């Protein structure tokens, strides 16, 4: 048949987890910074990042279907023993960074629900209970969790939808920002946050997860018709999931763009004092523009539109953090199953990720303040943008070789588009790393920074050289 919902319902199950995977708290933070630094003018790059992320997720589905072994397994079989462990360690660092960003977001939301009675370290300690939830799930062995993901999308959609309905932003301006590429009056940190959003939307570890979830569906690899049908339907399912995630991201960008774009500190301080909520001394009184965090965004939202919008924003961040936790556990489990061949349970993986996440975050929370936590969040964002090439390259390298894919290699346009995509991404990363290095200027710590930079560039050059051999 050409297309039918009867066959569409059979292939369901990867779609919900892929949909929640694109709305971790880091994605909401990237949209949050997008909606105050630049407003609507830098919304089209969200659509571009979502479109190229799907067009990469379909390659993940193709690698999953045509050969039953998912992306971590074929990565184990293809590359040698030396770079396999290094690429695995960089993927682990990316997953740990995502889980640490989750811990920051969940700690901020736990602090913000309770009206500040719970300290930040209290929220970071309260985030440990996800591990005990995973213990109870393994013990009882539900092993389905689709209803969770559906309820998660339900609560997140109704939260940010209530935010959008309350603020009532202009659809003409948001569509103008959406479909007309134009960034007038640009400034170099504005393009820095542009690279931040394009690096944060394409999460690095989603491929491995999508390939493994596609592998979970039984399918005859030899038969061509079932292969093509399952491949195209997983592509449509990923398209629907990414469309829903893109709509929620657009809601976040539009609400923060219309509400607090360009509002100086005096206006928000006067309005929030008129509201009489106790959270007023956080913002200074000076001519500068409003700086928004996951916390400070919630405070300005509460002081503008009452406590209901604040609690809805915080519970939305909590649901997004739960999504990032579950996606991190699943992707990490398949990564350890494939790369170095350890059949670790979900509980051991969540203990590893959550412990390495909470130790620096508990230190920073119990010592330093919320502004340094958001600075660490920005550091994790630029880290995720740094880790983007290790997801862009190897999938393109593996699902184009004729021996591994049989007759389902990529066509000429797909390969050349991937070539220009890898070239623009690694050139952006090289320029951004030297931009970050030139500020440093130290006698010695400049040297170890240069050592890290040249090591990373050598590894990215090796992967790109392997890809150009493959293409
Ligand atoms: Mn992330």
Numbering used by the authors: 92 to 562
From the primary publication:
In humans, this protein family contains two paralogs, the ubiquitously expressed DMT1, which is involved in the uptake and distribution of Fe2+ and Mn2+, and NRAMP1, which participates in the resistance against infections and nutrient recycling. We show that both proteins catalyze selective metal ion transport coupled to the symport of H+, but additionally also mediate uncoupled H+ flux. Their structures, while sharing general properties with known prokaryotic homologs, display distinct features that lead to stronger transition metal ion selectivity.
We then prepared samples of complexes of DMT1 containing either both binders (Sb1 and Sb2), or only Sb2 to record data in presence of Mn2+ by cryo-EM. Datasets of the ternary DMT1/Sb1/Sb2 complex and the binary DMT1/Sb2 complex yielded reconstructions at resolutions of 3.9 and 3.6 Å respectively, which both permitted the assignment of structural features of the transporter. Whereas both sybodies were visible in certain 2D classes, Sb2, which presumably binds to an intracellular epitope, was not defined after 3D reconstruction due to the intrinsic heterogeneity of the interaction. In both datasets, the transporter resides in a single conformation that carries features of an occluded state observed in homologs from prokaryotes and plants. Upon superposition of the membrane-spanning helices, the RMSDs of 2.3 and 2.2 Å compared to the inward-occluded and outward-facing conformations of the bacterial transporter emphasize that the observed structure of DMT1 represents an intermediate state situated in-between the two conformations of the prokaryotic homolog. Conversely, on the closed intracellular access to the binding site, we find a tighter interaction in DMT1occ where α1a, the major mobile element upon the transition into an inward-facing state, engages in tight interactions with α5 and α8, which are much less pronounced in the prokaryotic homolog. While metal ion interactions prevail in all conformations, they are supposed to be most extended in an occluded state of the transporter where the ion is largely surrounded by either protein residues or single trapped water molecules, and where the access to this site is sealed from both sides of the membrane. Besides the described close contacts, the same region also harbors residues at somewhat larger distance including Ser 189 and Gln 192, both on α3, which potentially also contribute to ion stabilization by either providing weaker direct or water-mediated interactions in a second coordination shell.
